[PDB]
Design a protein around this nucleic acid. Sequence first.
RNA 1: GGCCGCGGCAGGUUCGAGUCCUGCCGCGCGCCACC
Length: 443
Amino acid sequence: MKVEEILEKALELVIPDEEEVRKGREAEEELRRRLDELGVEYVFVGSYARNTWLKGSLEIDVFLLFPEEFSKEELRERGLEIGKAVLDSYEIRYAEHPYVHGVVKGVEVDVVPCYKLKEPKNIKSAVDRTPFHHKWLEGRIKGKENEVRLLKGFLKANGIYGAEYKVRGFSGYLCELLIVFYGSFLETVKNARRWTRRTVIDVAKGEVRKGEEFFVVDPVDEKRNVAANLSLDNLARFVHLCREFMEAPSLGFFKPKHPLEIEPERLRKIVEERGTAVFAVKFRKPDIVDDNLYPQLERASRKIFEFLERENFMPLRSAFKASEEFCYLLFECQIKEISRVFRRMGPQFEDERNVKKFLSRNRAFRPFIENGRWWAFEMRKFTTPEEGVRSYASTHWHTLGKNVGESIREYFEIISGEKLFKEPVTAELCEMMGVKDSNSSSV
RNA sequence: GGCCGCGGCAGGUUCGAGUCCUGCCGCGCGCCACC
Ligand SMILES: Nc1ccn([C@@H]2O[C@H](COP(=O)(O)OP(=O)(O)OP(=O)(O)O)[C@@H](O)[C@H]2O)c(=O)n1
Ligand SMILES: [Mg+2]
């Protein structure tokens, strides 16, 4: 359990076994065979072309390079055409930039169309930097392949690996740049402890400077932030893990933690012990890609959360879950019920023109003067969070994200109490409420 | 699809809105994700 003895035992978890590598090289050989037959200019990129892919996560990436003059429509129609021809089975489902996900001799393959650029300053597509990323990294990452796999596995085990909107973590390319900048996994962790939200890491200049936000400068484009989609919280979660690790190293930092089935009875006791209002908004999952869904679930959850605050239900945290059929927006509040009456502010006693208008309004109770101005007692239209959210989600369905809001419009329901604990949201509830010992890394 | 702006324009809430909530439109190949 020394710092180095543990990184030894952890390499056995992140390094692919020779039975998987052979399966990868065999698929790579067949892929080049079919691609060469089509006479298309292509290039292998990603973690596979650099031998930095994690164990159990084998995926080959192939970029097809087309002329600059091609329309975005022509790029797609030709890209998808080649892709379908090369892959055994394929699947076309993307958010913006077209590509083909499929299989070749049993391995995951992605055939991505892009432009054959010279100097990637003003890229035309989003993915035109990727060949240039591979060209810059192949010569510098050599020898340090396992130092990347330690960093990737370290993050994946703590659920902050990936730049996708489902994660908002560290892209696999960001990890490689960090190893080139620090040399080893150990040196990244040591230095990561003193990162801040202002840290700028310019790999191209071998410099660490201060800036406006966390910014890892892309060697290929000094305007591009490689860590653009790394949330501030996940940045923090990483720094916290590094300080914890150096303070007390362990192999568990690399073991993926999975949730535990919590009894619906134990959960009912925890919520009762807290005395908070725990409820959820349930609606049909819109049939869209995760990268469109999660930003909207984030938005919807925020809009309802913000509503609860200004309505004085004093919310604690928010959360959401996406099952196969349904989406859930979870909330916890300190106020299960508020009075119907509240005090609305009136004008100062001086200018009677405003006061006369203020006092003319028919109210159930008599207004009063306090500290030099008038006040009135008015009634609320709802006195609980559930009743409030019911109203908001019904009327303001449109502002909860395009697809989510349109799904909430057609139907939604607020689930509370025990009826909630039978839903697929136990894990999300325990994370939200800070329940202890609801996770484990037992194999 | 989400996010950030320069503007706006109207509407709702209010004694009172350039200031809180909402809807619509323009412009930065604006930024990010799908690789
Ligand atoms: N947010 C992202 C994600 C990736 N890439 C580019 O996409 C390539 C590979 O895509 P991806 O599969 O997403 O990352 P991998 O390096 O393959 O990581 P992993 O295999 O673990 O998924 C990288 O070379 C990188 O230049 C990028 O610039 N921006
Ligand atoms: Mg890959």
